[PDB]
Symmetry: C4
Subunit: 325 residues, 4 copies
C-alpha cells in the first residue's frame, strides 16, 4: 500500500476566519519572542542569502524591529566584520549570522561569537541529518548561553530532534522557497502550512519558537504562517531587490532589477546537483516602505481576527480550507 | 494541530439540481422581504460604492423593483440631498444610504433620517468589530423603527452579533468582491456560498433576512446565493459601467469604459493599507437591459428547480458539489 | 445548512480500469438496444440541432449503424418530408424526429407518424417539467406502440418520471453540452458521469435504455458514458462541420468552417434569455471517417477492459477517480 | 451506482517526506535487482522505442549501470545483430530486446536468444490480455532460465497474472507516457503512483520486481516511482534527443531537435486507431551527462529521506498528499 503519512496544506489552501474584535489595526502589538531571551518588535527575519542579507540590509531591518542573517557565502574575516559593522552601529542593534553544518566550521563559529553575534544560524538544507544535530550539540556544549537557530525541518520528529540537540529556535521549510527546485529535483517537500503546524505541535510546552521559512509572497502569507503557530517568518524574495540588499542594480529595458538566486543554484555554488534557480527581481526601493506595507497587512489581519498580539494570532485565529475554485 | 474550522465553498464549487416543476420561467415571482417591513419586487441591491450608486442609479434600480445604497464618500449635505432626490421623485421609490461605523457619524445619520432614508446601512469591512455593534445598538435605541442593515460578516457568530445588536437585515461578505484584495493583504476571507448558508442557519426563526454581498458575476451566481439562503444580493461590478452609475464615460482604443474601484482602494481612500483595487469596466449601457437579462436568468433557474417564489428557491433548491474539472 | 445532495463527477474526473481480456478490438460488438424494439449497430445518435441533423446527415449516420434526429427548427411539412426522404431511401434506414413539449404540437406529431418516423423525440431543456410529462402521457395514449424518447433529465427522480410517463428511452443531460451556457445563466447543471449513473440506477430492471446526451468531445468520453450505464450517446459538436450536416461551408483565413450553435442561442431562437452560444466549427469532412475513428477508439477501450459487447461495457467496466493533476 | 474502484494518484499528487538521515548524497547506493539474477548499478531502463533505443544507446546506458531495450520496429536479422553488437562490445555489457505478444514471434524470440539477449521483453499495450499471458507461458516452458519482462499492466490482478505466467519482472504503465493519447482515445488509464503501489503490493513476497514505465519527466518522478515500490524505472522522453538515440539531428530555427514518437503513433505504425503522438524533442547531448544529473537528483532524495539503498527508498520513504495549490 502507498505510504501516505497525511494530506498537507500550503498557503493557498487556507483562509483566516474573521472573528469578534476589540482590536483596531493601529492598536495591534507585533512584538514576538524569537527565542526565550530575544524579543523582536516585528516578526521578520531576513534570509541568509548572498542576494539578500549583508550588514546594510541587517542594519535597516533591525531598525524596523526585525533581524538580519549574514550569509555564509564569504570568508570568515569578511563575515566577522559584517557582524561587527551591525553590532558597532548606534542604536544597540541585534544581528545573526549563518554557518554550514559540515566539518571545519568551528573556526567560523568562534570568530562570529568574538565579533558579537546575537544568534548563530546553523544553515542546512536538511536539518534532520545526523551531522547537523551533532554540530549543534557540540556548539551548545562549547557555548552554553549562545542563541542558536537550527534548520531546516518540515516534520514533528525533525522539530523535536533540533530542540533536543540544543536549538533556541527551530526553522521550518523544506521546498516552499520561491527559488526552490527540490520538489522537481528530489521529489521531496512538505506544504508549509502543515509543516509549521506539525513542528509547533511537537514543540508545545518547550518554549522553543518556530520560524516559518520560505514561500512568503504577500502579507496574507505572513498572517497565515503565524496563525499556523510560527513566532516569526523568514523572507528572501520579499526583501530581494531592495536598496539595502547586496549586489548592483541592473537595467534591462527601462525597469531596474537586482539578482535573486537560491544558495543551491549553480551560480551560488561556484558535487551536488542544483536545488535552486538564478533569477532577476524588480528593484523594490527602500526596505522601510516594504516593511510598512507588509506589517500594515498583518495589522489589518489582527483587526479582522480580534488578535491583539502575535501570541493571540498564533493560538486563537482559525482557518477554513478552500478548493482551487 | 492546524485550527481548521471547516471546508468552505464558493459559487464555482456548486451547481443547482434540476427538479420536478410546474413553474414556467415567465410565471416565477421575484419579490422578496429585504426586512420584515420592506418588500422588494426583485432581489437586487446596488453596492454603496462611489463608482456605483448615487441618486440616478438608485432611481433606475428602484424603478426595476430593487433598491440603491448612496455611498458615504461625500459630504453629509450632498448625501442627504441625494436621498431627497430619490424620495421626492415620483412613483414612491425607496432608497438606502451608507454610514461609517466609527465615531462622529451621529450627525450624518440624523441628516439621512430627516431626508427620508428608508433603510440605513452601517457600512463596515468588519461587522463583527465591537465598535460596529455598539454604533448599531445606539442607532437602534435612538431610532426604534428605522430599518437598519449591518455588515459585513461571514460567520454564524457574526450574523447572531448583528441581529442581537438590532439589525433589520444582515449583510454577508468577507473577501468575495471582484475588486477585493483582502485575501492577499490580510489572508482573511470566507468563500461566499458557505458564508451565506452559515449566516442564514444562525438566523433561522428570527425573521432577519441575509443579503449576499460580493462576487456575483453572472445570473447563475444570483440563483446560487439565494438557494444558499440569501433573501437578496448586493452587486457592484454587475452595475458598474451602466449609464446611470456616477462618473464619466472614458474612451481608450475605440471601446467605452467607466471607472470601478473598491472603497478600500488608494484612490477611494484619498492610515490603513489598501484592501481593494482601481480598475476600468466596459460601458454596459442602460441598467434596465442589464436587470432584464439577469432576472431572466433567475427566472429560468426557478423554472428548472420548480421554485415559484424567492422563498421556495431559498428553502427547497438543492446543490451538487463539483470538482475543478 | 447548505443543501448539498452529493458530489457529482464529469468525464475528466474518471478513467476506465484495464482488466483481464479475451477481447481483441476488431472482435468487439458495438450493437445496442436504443429501445426494447430498436437495436442499433453503433451506439451513436446525432443531435436534434439545426446545425447538425437533417435528412442528409440522418441517412449517412443510419448507413454507419446509428440514427439521426431531424430538428424541430422548420415547418411541419418540411420536417415530415425530411423524414420521408430518409424512410423512402433504399436500405431500410431508421429515422427519428424532434418535437417541442408545449401546446400545439399534436399536428406536428401526427404528420411525423404518418411520414413513417421510427422514434419520436420529445425535445425539452427540462424533461422533469409537468408540461413535458403530460404531453408524453398523451402521445403514449394516442400512439401506444410508437417509440418515444423523452428528455432531458439529470437525476434518478427525473428518469423515473419520464419512464412512468411512457418513454421507450430516457435522455440524460442538463448542462454538459459544448455550446451550453445554462451553468452560467441559471446556475443549474449536473456533471454527466453522475447524471447518467443516477438515471441508469433508477431505471434498473425496467428495460428502458438511457441516452448520454452532451459533452462528448473524444471517443474516450463515449466509452466512459457507456460504462456509466448509457446504452448510447447523442453527439452535436462531434458531427457538426461534417459534409452531410446542414448549412454552407464558409472560408475564414484559408481553413474551411461550418456554423454550430445551441438551439437556445439568440440565432436559433430568432421571451427566454439564451442558454446557448453561436460558434464556428472546423470542416470535418465525410461523416464515415469520423465514425470509423471514434468507433475505433471505443473498440480499443473494449479490448483494454475485456468487454466484448456494449452490455458488458455498461455493466462490468470499472473506473478510478483522478485529481486535477 | 457508479463503479469507482478507488481514487488514484499521479506523480504531481504527492511529495516525499524528509526524515532522520545518516546518508550523504555521495554515499547512496543506486544498485537494484531488475530480476532475481540481474542486478543493475543504476535503476534505469531505456524504452523499447524506435526513437529511443538501438545498439548505440543500449551500449551507452549499460556503461552507466543501466540497461537498454532494442525496439521491435525492425527485421528479425537487424534486431539479432543489434543485440550481438551490444553483447560482443567489450566490458561484459547486458542488453534486452522487445517482441510483440501476437502470433508469429517464436522465430524472432529464437533469434534473440541465439544472439545472446540477457532479458526478453514481451512488449504489449495490454499485458492483462489472455494472448499475452499465453505467449509468456509458452516462452517460459521453452526457455526455463531466460529472464522475461512482461507488461504493461496497472492493477494488482494484472501484476499477479504476469507473475503467474512466468515473468521474471513486471512492467507497470497504462496511459502515463508523455506521448500517450489512450486516455483521450479509449478513456482508459491508471495514475502511475497508484498503479505501481498496487502492482508491488500484489507481488510482495514473490521476489518479482516492478518496473515503473512512463511519465518520468524529472529525477523527482524517479524517486517517487521507487518509493511507490518500483525497483527500476523505464524512460522514453528523458533519453530521446540524446546523441546515442537513433535517427538524425534536425535544425528548425537555430536549435537542434530529434524525433520522438509513440510506438502507437501513425508514423510508427506505417487496423488500430493511433494511441500515441509524433513529436520533436530538443537535442539533449551525450547520455552520460543526462544520467549524471538525474542520478544526482535521486542521490539528494536518498540523503533527504535517510535511505542509503534503493531497497530502503522502496520500503521506508513516506509521502504526503498535496492539493493542486
Ligand atoms: C544544492 C544545494 O541546495 C540547497 C541549498 C540551500 C537550501 N536551503 C534551504 C532549503 C533547500 C536548500 C537547497 C532545499 C530544501 O528546502 C530548504 C544543497 C547544498 N547542500 C546540501 C544539499 C543536500 N543535502 C541533502 Cl541530504 C540533499 N541535498 C543541497
Ligand atoms: C482599506 C479598507 O478596505 C476595505 C474597505 C471597504 C470594504 N468593504 C467591504 C469588504 C472589505 C472592505 C475593505 C474587505 C472584506 O470584505 C468586504 C478598510 C477600511 N476600513 C477599515 C478596514 C479594516 N478594518 C479592519 Cl479590522 C481590517 N481592515 C479596511
Ligand atoms: C433558451 C433555451 O435554451 C435551451 C434550448 C435547448 C436546450 N437543450 C438541451 C439542454 C438545454 C437547452 C437550453 C439546457 C440544459 O441542458 C440541456 C430554452 C428553450 N426553452 C426552454 C428553456 C427553459 N426552460 C426552463 Cl424551465 C428553463 N429554461 C430554455
Ligand atoms: C495503436 C497502438 O498503441 C499503443 C502502442 C504501444 C503502447 N505501449 C505502451 C502503452 C500503450 C501503447 C499503445 C497504451 C497504454 O499504455 C502503455 C496499439 C498497438 N497494439 C495494440 C493496441 C491495443 N490493444 C488493445 Cl486491447 C487496445 N489497444 C494499441
Ligand atoms: O537554492 C535553494 N533551494 C531551496 N531553498 C533555498 C535555496 N536557497 C535558499 N532557500 C530557502 O528559501 C528561503 C527563501 O524563500 P522565499 O522567501 O520564498 O524566497 C531561504 O530562507 C531558504 O530557506
Ligand atoms: O476595497 C474594497 N475591498 C473589498 N471589498 C470591497 C471594497 N469595496 C467594496 N467592497 C465590497 O465588494 C462589494 C462589491 O462586489 P462585486 O459585486 O463582486 O464587485 C461591495 O458591495 C462591498 O461589500
Ligand atoms: O442552446 C443550448 N443550450 C444547452 N444545451 C443545448 C443547446 N442546444 C442543444 N443543447 C444540447 O447539447 C447537445 C449537444 O452537445 P455536444 O455534443 O457537447 O455539442 C444536444 O444534443 C442538446 O441536448
Ligand atoms: O504510442 C504509444 N502510446 C502510449 N504509450 C506508449 C506509446 N509508445 C510507447 N509508450 C509507452 O510510453 C513509455 C515512454 O514514456 P515517457 O518516458 O513518459 O516518454 C514507453 O516505455 C511505453 O511504455
Amino acid at each position: 500500500s502507498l505510504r501516505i503519512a497525511k494530506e498537507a496544506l500550503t498557503f493557498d489552501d487556507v483562509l483566516l476566519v474573521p472573528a469578534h474584535s476589540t482590536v483596531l489595526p493601529n492598536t495591534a502589538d507585533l512584538s514576538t519572542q524569537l527565542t526565550k531571551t530575544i524579543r523582536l518588535n516585528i516578526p521578520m527575519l531576513s534570509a541568509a542569502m548572498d542576494t539578500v542579507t549583508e550588514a546594510r540590509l541587517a542594519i535597516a531591518l533591525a531598525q524596523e524591529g526585525g533581524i538580519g542573517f549574514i550569509h555564509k557565502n564569504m570568508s570568515i574575516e569578511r563575515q566577522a566584520e559584517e557582524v561587527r559593522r551591525v553590532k558597532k552601529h548606534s542604536g544597540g542593534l541585534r544581528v545573526g549570522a549563518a554557518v554550514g553544518a559540515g566539518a571545519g566550521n568551528e573556526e567560523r563559529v568562534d570568530a562570529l561569537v568574538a565579533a558579537g553575534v546575537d544568534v548563530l544560524l546553523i544553515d542546512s538544507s536538511h536539518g534532520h541529518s545526523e551531522g547537523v544535530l551533532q554540530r549543534i550539540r557540540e556548539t551548545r556544549a562549547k557555548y552554553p548561553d549562545l542563541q542558536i537557530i537550527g534548520g531546516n525541518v518540515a516534520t514533528a520528529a525533525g522539530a523535536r530532534a533540533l530542540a533536543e540537540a540544543g536549538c533556541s529556535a527551530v526553522k521550518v521549510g523544506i521546498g516552499p522557497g520561491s527559488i526552490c527546485t527540490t520538489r522537481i529535483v528530489t521529489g521531496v517537500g512538505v506544504p508549509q502550512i502543515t509543516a509549521v503546524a506539525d513542528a509547533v505541535e511537537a514543540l508545545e510546552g518547550t518554549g522553543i519558537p518556530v520560524i516559518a521559512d520560505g514561500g512568503i509572497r504577500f502579507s496574507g502569507d505572513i498572517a497565515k504562517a503565524i496563525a499556523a503557530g510560527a513566532s516569526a517568518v523568514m523572507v528572501g524574495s520579499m526583501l530581494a531587490g531592495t536598496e539595502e540588499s547586496p549586489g548592483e542594480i541592473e537595467l534591462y529595458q527601462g525597469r531596474s532589477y537586482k539578482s535573486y538566486r537560491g544558495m543551491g543554484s549553480l551560480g551560488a555554488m561556484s558535487k551536488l546537483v542544483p536545488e535552486g534557480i538564478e533569477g532577476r527581481v524588480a528593484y523594490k526601493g527602500r526596505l522601510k516602505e516594504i516593511i510598512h506595507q507588509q506589517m500594515g497587512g498583518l495589522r489589518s489581519c489582527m483587526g479582522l481576527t480580534g488578535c491583539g498580539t502575535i501570541d493571540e494570532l498564533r493560538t486563537k485565529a482559525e482557518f477554513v480550507r478552500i478548493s482551487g475554485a
